[PDB]
Amino acid sequence: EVAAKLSGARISAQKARLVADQIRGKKVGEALNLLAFSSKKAAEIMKKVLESAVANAEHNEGADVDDLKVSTVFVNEGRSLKRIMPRAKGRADRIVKRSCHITVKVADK
Amino acid sequence: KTYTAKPETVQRDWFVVDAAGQTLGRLATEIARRLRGKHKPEYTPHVDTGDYIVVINAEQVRVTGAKTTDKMYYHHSGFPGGIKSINFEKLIAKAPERVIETAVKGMLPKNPLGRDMYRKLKVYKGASHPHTAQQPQELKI
Amino acid sequence: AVQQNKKSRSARDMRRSHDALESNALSVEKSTGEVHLRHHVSPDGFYRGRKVV
Amino acid sequence: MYAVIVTGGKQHKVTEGEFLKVEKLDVATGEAIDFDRVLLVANGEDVKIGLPVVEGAKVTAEVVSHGRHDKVRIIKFRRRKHHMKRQGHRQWFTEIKITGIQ
Amino acid sequence: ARVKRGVIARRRHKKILKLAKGYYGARSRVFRVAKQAVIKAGQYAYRDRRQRKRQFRALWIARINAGARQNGLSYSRLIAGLKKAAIEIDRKVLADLAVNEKAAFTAIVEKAKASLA
RNA sequence: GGGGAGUGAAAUAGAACCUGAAACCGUAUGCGUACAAGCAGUGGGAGCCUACUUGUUAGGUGACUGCGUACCUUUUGUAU
RNA sequence: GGGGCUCAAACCACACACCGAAGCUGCGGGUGUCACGUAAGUGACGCGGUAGAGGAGCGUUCUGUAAGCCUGUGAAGGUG
Ligand SMILES: [Mg+2]
Ligand SMILES: [Mg+2]
Ligand SMILES: [Mg+2]
Ligand SMILES: [Mg+2]
Numbered sequence: 086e087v088a089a090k091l092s093g094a095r096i097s098a099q100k101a102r103l104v105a106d107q108i109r110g111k112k113v114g115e116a117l118n119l120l121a122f123s124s125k126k127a128a129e130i131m132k133k134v135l136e137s138a139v140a141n142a143e144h145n146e147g148a149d150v151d152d153l154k155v156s157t158v159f160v161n162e163g164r165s166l167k168r169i170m171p172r173a174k175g176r177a178d179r180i181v182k183r184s185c186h187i188t189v190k191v192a193d194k
Numbered sequence: 195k196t197y198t199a200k201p202e203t204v205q206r207d208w209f210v211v212d213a214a215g216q217t218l219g220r221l222a223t224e225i226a227r228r229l230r231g232k233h234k235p236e237y238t239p240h241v242d243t244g245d246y247i248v249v250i251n252a253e254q255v256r257v258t259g260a261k262t263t264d265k266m267y268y269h270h271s272g273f274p275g276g277i278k279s280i281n282f283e284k285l286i287a288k289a290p291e292r293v294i295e296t297a298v299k300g301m302l303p304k305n306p307l308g309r310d311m312y313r314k315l316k317v318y319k320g321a322s323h324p325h326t327a328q329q330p331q332e333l334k335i
Numbered sequence: 336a337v338q339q340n341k342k343s344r345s346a347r348d349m350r351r352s353h354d355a356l357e358s359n360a361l362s363v364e365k366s367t368g369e370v371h372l373r374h375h376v377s378p379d380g381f382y383r384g385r386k387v388v
Numbered sequence: 389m390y391a392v393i394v395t396g397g398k399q400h401k402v403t404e405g406e407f408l409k410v411e412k413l414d415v416a417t418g419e420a421i422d423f424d425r426v427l428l429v430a431n432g433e434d435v436k437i438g439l440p441v442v443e444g445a446k447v448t449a450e451v452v453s454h455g456r457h458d459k460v461r462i463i464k465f466r467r468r469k470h471h472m473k474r475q476g477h478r479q480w481f482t483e484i485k486i487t488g489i490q
Numbered sequence: 491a492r493v494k495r496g497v498i499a500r501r502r503h504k505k506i507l508k509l510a511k512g513y514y515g516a517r518s519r520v521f522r523v524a525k526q527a528v529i530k531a532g533q534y535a536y537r538d539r540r541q542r543k544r545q546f547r548a549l550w551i552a553r554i555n556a557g558a559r560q561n562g563l564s565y566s567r568l569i570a571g572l573k574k575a576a577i578e579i580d581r582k583v584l585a586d587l588a589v590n591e592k593a594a595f596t597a598i599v600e601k602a603k604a605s606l607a
Numbered sequence: 608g609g610g611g612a613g614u615g616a617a618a619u620a621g622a623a624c625c626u627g628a629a630a631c632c633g634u635a636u637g638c639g640u641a642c643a644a645g646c647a648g649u650g651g652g653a654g655c656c657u658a659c660u661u662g663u664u665a666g667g668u669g670a671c672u673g674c675g676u677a678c679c680u681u682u683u684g685u686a687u
Numbered sequence: 688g689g690g691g692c693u694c695a696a697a698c699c700a701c702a703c704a705c706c707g708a709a710g711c712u713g714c715g716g717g718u719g720u721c722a723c724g725u726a727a728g729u730g731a732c733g734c735g736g737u738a739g740a741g742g743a744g745c746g747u748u749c750u751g752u753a754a755g756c757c758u759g760u761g762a763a764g765g766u767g
């Protein structure tokens with residue numbers, strides 16, 4: 086097996102859990118077709134990672150792009166940037182701006 | 195340590211009761227004793243070991259004194275002002291089999307074992323039962 | 336108004352169980368061998384085997 | 389072959405080849421112990437019980453080991469009254485082994 | 491001599507959170523809830539050492555009672571029958587003979603009837 | 608941003624860099640839950656699982672069932 | 688308290704039997720005071736407890752003993 090990462094990615098964690106669960110346990114032929122037509126922000130980022138995990142299995146190993154079945158997809162959480170935003174009657178409140186860590190791991194078994 | 199029964203090594207039998215003049219709550223205290231399993235030496239409380247019962251005349255049953263024209267059976271419906279009542283005599287011509295089931299149901303635990311002891315009771319308002327395959331023996335002669 | 340007790344890990348995860356996805360209306364073009372969506376123009380410009388754009 | 393011997397203020401269901409945990413008694417390890425406090429002796433079907441006790445019958449045992457088992461806890465707490473008190477306990481025992489039902 | 495208390499506070503927290511594992515929810519992972527559920531689970535373990543002795547005694551009696559009716563007595567007349575003589579067999583080792591050694595139990599019941607009590 | 612390759616005693620020492628805990632969030636593996644009412648534990652306890660030294664042992668789950676109205680402070684008095 | 692109860696599963700006389708607490712007894716441990724049997728080589732009757740009075744201990748950091756002793760075959764920590 087070979088891996089790939091994207092540590093630092095502007096979409097939040099919980100919004101991008103809904104795309105990881107859709108493809109966990111499929112073959113990478115049709116996994117690149119669910120993400121070519123999904124209408125969500127996380128899907129353009131996860132396909133950029135899924136084709137980076139394949140091109141490592143072709144160059145660093147001798148694994149063909151056919152027998153790969155995507156094994157372990159998990160989305161961790163990363164640093165959050167803290168900012169303020171004013172509200173009415175003087176009181177101001179605080180906004181977080183989240184990110185995540187994605188790790189797509191394909192296996193040639 | 196003391197012996198407990200096991201649910202996959204249990205022996206259960208088939209009894210048939212004739213209610214043809216029996217007093218309602220004195221009949222029903224002997225059904226509810228033998229559904230729970232107080233007549234067996236290997237009685238354990240947490241698992242169930244009792245005998246199936248078939249009752250063959252749920253309309254010949256007898257109550258004592260002036261209770262035939264009394265003894266309302268109240269129950270509520272959920273809606274406001276939905277209290278309902280029916281006495282003993284008018285109920286026994288509508289559904290005779292539900293007189294003798296609600297007397298036994300209130301003499302059992304209110305557990306999910308009580309709901310499982312209640313499924314071994316099988317009453318009939320007729321004169322014969324569709325359990326000739328199981329061949330119930332007679333008790334309480 | 337506000338709550339009076341916080342919601343546990345169970346009653347928070349049970350809410351988001353009705354929330355999944357699907358887009359499986361895919362189709363293989365007979366001529367070009369290109370994958371697209373059912374009743375849509377293919378990303379090269381073919382609909383039922385005919386160039387339109 | 390099953391007897392009813394009375395060891396420590398309580399009696400047991402002792403067979404011919406039992407290991408058995410008894411409360412602690414004053415004898416060393418390896419020595420043999422007789423029991424003259426048997427209450428019913430059965431054999432096959434041939435069972436007899438005592439008038440208060442059974443005459444002549446003996447049970448021979450010997451000590452395997454000693455020890456202390458299973459530390460338990462005690463908490464004496466009172467709500468709202470500023471009082472809490474703890475303590476531990478490990479009870480002794482004596483494991484024996486039964487040879488013959490005389 | 492300034493003492494900082496951040497290393498001996500931790501050993502006493504891990505000692506609580508070890509007795510309190512296997513519990514539902516936040517009772518097994520945060521400390522201000524898991525201290526209440528160790529004291530409460532120690533009071534129950536103190537009361538139920540007494541109630542253990544009451545739940546088997548009430549189980550031995552209800553097995554002698556079922557076994558001795560099948561031979562032709564009750565429970566309460568059997569105990570008066572055995573104490574006319576002195577058979578001196580307790581409840582733990584009568585409810586063993588009721589289930590397993592059923593033929594030796596019948597040889598006891600006939601002697602309580604012969605005791606005419 | 609990663610996957611190699613090289614430096615180094617050691618890159619899960621890679622510059623947001625010694626050690627790197629708790630709350631919080633995940634991913635795998637085992638066992639239990641969709642006809643059953645409550646301070647969520649305790650006493651008894653079926654079954655299943657793993658390692659065993661092959662199981663009158665150990666570990667993990669706990670169907671079923673008896674008793675059970677949190678902690679502190681103020682009070683003559685609090686599940687309140 | 689509920690099912691249910693009519694020569695009663697109600698009331699009055701009456702008789703035995705059983706059940707029933709952490710109560711008493713049995714067995715096993717532990718401590719307090721006094722007495723002695725050089726007063727532990729030792730018996731007796733005691734051991735619910737708030738405010739409060741009396742007795743006896745654990746651990747942390749620094750100093751003496753420390754120019755000692757332990758440690759790169761691996762310290763302090765973190766985790767089983
Ligand atoms: Mg302003
Ligand atoms: Mg090198
Ligand atoms: Mg490390
Ligand atoms: Mg390092």
Ligand SMILES: [Mg+2]
Pocket residue numbers: none
């Ligand atoms: Mg950091």
Ligand SMILES: [Mg+2]
Pocket residue numbers: none
């Ligand atoms: Mg250094």
Ligand SMILES: [Mg+2]
Pocket residue numbers: none
């Ligand atoms: Mg670091």
Ligand SMILES: [Mg+2]
Pocket residue numbers: none
């Ligand atoms: Mg989870």
Ligand SMILES: [Mg+2]
Pocket residue numbers: 644
């Ligand atoms: Mg509920």
Ligand SMILES: [Mg+2]
Pocket residue numbers: none
């Ligand atoms: Mg209820």
Ligand SMILES: [Mg+2]
Pocket residue numbers: none
């Ligand atoms: Mg006061």
Ligand SMILES: [Mg+2]
Pocket residue numbers: none
């Ligand atoms: Mg309140």
Ligand SMILES: [Mg+2]
Pocket residue numbers: none
């Ligand atoms: Mg009379």
Ligand SMILES: [Mg+2]
Pocket residue numbers: none
């Ligand atoms: Mg008692």
Ligand SMILES: [Mg+2]
Pocket residue numbers: none
């Ligand atoms: Mg006492």
Ligand SMILES: [Mg+2]
Pocket residue numbers: none
């Ligand atoms: Mg005291």
Ligand SMILES: [Mg+2]
Pocket residue numbers: none
């Ligand atoms: Mg130090």
Ligand SMILES: [Mg+2]
Pocket residue numbers: none
């Ligand atoms: Mg270490």
